Structures are given as structure tokens and as C-alpha cells.
């Protein structure tokens, strides 16, 4: 697909940041190496459900004033294409496949089959969690349902699973044409308190490590690489300075389009014609 690393990072960082900040012992583990008073002050101010201060995330160049006490500024950077395929053919498909998804589901009995229902039509099934079927189990997929023979499996009549699968758009042939790009995004934790900037740096590094395992950047946005700048005053001529430490996140990812092929051939036919010269 076409991709937007900045919007991915914003969408991914915001919930993760919230879920760490609402959970005190996580911060208590992340900041174990800092000075005791720095740790306790940060945990008192920003952390837990009762926290009176709050962190914020957003892109650069807003028209309004931000929460300069603690704010992650996201800032789309450079990139370059790095590796190309022969013919620019990144892949080919017989059935137009969408995004990868993971969904929780439960088995149910139906007509002496077990079935799992999924919210969308299954274009491909990658894994039913914790199950490997035998041929006897007569595994079949149909529409948005996975179906599974009941006879030997009655104990599992309410078994709970996670389905990893991917959508289908439509039944069509084509070529995925495109290339790989290596692209940079900068993130900086602004604070007018230097110890807050240092803690926001630690929290961001933890978040990015945790992010490396996510499906989003396992399937796309691969090879996350981190670089770190000096701590410096971002703005120097207010009633106080504003500090931050930049980090650069670099990703390798595919830019591509679905070139559908309308041509289809369904029968050869043969004829002999005679040359009398």
C-alpha cells in the first residue's frame, strides 16, 4: 500500500502511552535506574489514574499552544528508496487481499460442525491460535466463517481462540507493483523541566521496544532503527527555557499498488489447416 509512518506512530503511541501511564508499577519498573526523587516526583505528577498532570501527543506546526509541561512532538522526516524488484513486481495474487487482522472468537456447534465466526470475509487464514488440524478434521473456510468437524472434538464445543487472518477485497488477479523505502520520523519529548524530559525519553524508548512486536510493524515498517540527539533548549527566550531530547525512528517499508489484470484465458483450442503450396 501507500503508507504514512507519521500517522501510524501517532495512532500507535497514544494508546500505549495512556496504558503505561495508568499503570504505576510499569513506570516504577521503567524508571528503576533514575534518582529516587526524580522517579517519585514523576510518578506522583503524571502517573496513575489520579494524575493531575497529563502528557500529550501531536504533530508539529499546530496553530494553538501546547502542554509544554510534557508533550511528544511527532515530526515527519526524510526517506529514500533502497531496494527494487525485477520488473518492480513486489508480489502477485489470485485474490485481492486486505490488511492482516487478529480477532478473538469462540467455537460453536452447528450441524455437527464446530465453527468460528469472524467479523469480515476471510481472504486467507494464517493461524487458528493453539490448534493444528489433521486431515481428518476436515478444516474448511467459507465466507467469513471457519468450520471444523465436531465428531471427535465435542470437548471443545465452547473453545476460545484467536484467529489471525486477512481480509479479501475481491476475486481478481493482479500484480503488486512497487518498491521499498527507508524513511525517518523524529520524536521529541518537550518539557520545561529537564528531569521530565529525561523521563519522557525513557518512557518513549520503552514504548518503541514494546512496539517492535506489534503486527503493524512486523508485517510493514520493518527494521526499526533508533538514533538519539543531545538534550538542548528548544526555545530559549521565554520566561523559561523549553528542553527536549530528539530521537529519530527509521523504518524500512514497501510502497506499492494493486495493478489488476483483466485479461483471463480459460480455454486453448487447436486447429489444423492444410498447406497445398
Amino acid at each position: 500500500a501507500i503508507t504514512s509512518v507519521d500517522s501510524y506512530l501517532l495512532s500507535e503511541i497514544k494508546p500505549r502511552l495512556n496504558t503505561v501511564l495508568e499503570n504505576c508499577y510499569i513506570i516504577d519498573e521503567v524508571l528503576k535506574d533514575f534518582d529516587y526523587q526524580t522517579r517519585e516526583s514523576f510518578k506522583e505528577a503524571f502517573c496513575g489514574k489520579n494524575a493531575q498532570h497529563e502528557v500529550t501527543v501531536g504533530f508539529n506546526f499546530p496553530k494553538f499552544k501546547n502542554n509544554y509541561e510534557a508533550h511528544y512532538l511527532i515530526q515527519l522526516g526524510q526517506g529514500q528508496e533502497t531496494k527494487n524488484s525485477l520488473g518492480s513486481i513486489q508480489s502477485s495474487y489470485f485474490e485481492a487481499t486486505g490488511d492482516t487482522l487478529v480477532e478473538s472468537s469462540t467455537a460453536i456447534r452447528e450441524d455437527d460442525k464446530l465453527v468460528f465466526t469472524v467479523s469480515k470475509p476471510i481472504g486467507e487464514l494464517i493461524k487458528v491460535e493453539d490448534i493444528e488440524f489433521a486431515k481428518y478434521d476436515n478444516l474448511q473456510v467459507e465466507g467469513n466463517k471457519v468450520s471444523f468437524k465436531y465428531q471427535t472434538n465435542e470437548d471443545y464445543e465452547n473453545y476460545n481462540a484467536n484467529i489471525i487472518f486477512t481480509e479479501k477485497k475481491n476475486d481478481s488477479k493482479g500484480l503488486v507493483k512497487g518498491f521499498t523505502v527507508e524513511e525517518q520520523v523524529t520524536v521529541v519529548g518537550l518539557s520545561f523541566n529537564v528531569d521530565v524530559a529525561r523521563c519522557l525519553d525513557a518512557v518513549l524508548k520503552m514504548i518503541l521496544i514494546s512496539m517492535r512486536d506489534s503486527i503493524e510493524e512486523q508485517q510493514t515498517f520493518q527494521l526499526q532503527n533508533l538514533s538519539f540527539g543531545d538534550i538542548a533548549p528548544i526555545i530559549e527566550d521565554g520566561d523559561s527555557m523549553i528542553f527536549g531530547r530528539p530521537t529519530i525512528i527509521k523504518y524500512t517499508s514497501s510502497l506499492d499498488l494493486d495493478y489488476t489484470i483483466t485479461q483471463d484465458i480459460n480455454k486453448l483450442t487447436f486447429k489444423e489447416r492444410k498447406d497445398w503450396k
Partner: protein
């Protein structure tokens, strides 16, 4: 003195438009209340400046 020396103007007051994207923080370019500027304006007021 000001009423003698100033020209008549229409003054209208700025405020941020509530169409700003809750994630990206940027204005919606199709917003009718503000034509892609992030700033909406209250009804005009006659003044001299």
C-alpha cells in the same frame, strides 16, 4: 480625536474553529465555517480605527 482621525472598519473576532482534526490537529480543508484557515470569526462589529 480617534473618531475624527480613524477610518471606518469592520472588526470580527478570531477563535479557533472546532473543526480541527482531533488527532492531526489541523483544520478540515472543506470546513464551511472556516475556509481552510484554522480560525473561525464571530459576526462583524463596526468600529473606527
Amino acid at each position: 480625536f480617534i473618531n475624527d482621525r480613524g477610518i471606518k472598519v469592520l472588526w470580527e473576532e478570531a477563535y479557533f474553529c472546532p473543526c480541527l482534526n482531533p488527532d492531526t490537529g489541523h483544520p478540515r480543508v472543506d470546513c464551511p465555517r472556516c475556509h481552510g484557515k484554522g480560525i473561525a470569526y464571530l459576526p462583524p462589529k463596526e468600529t473606527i480605527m
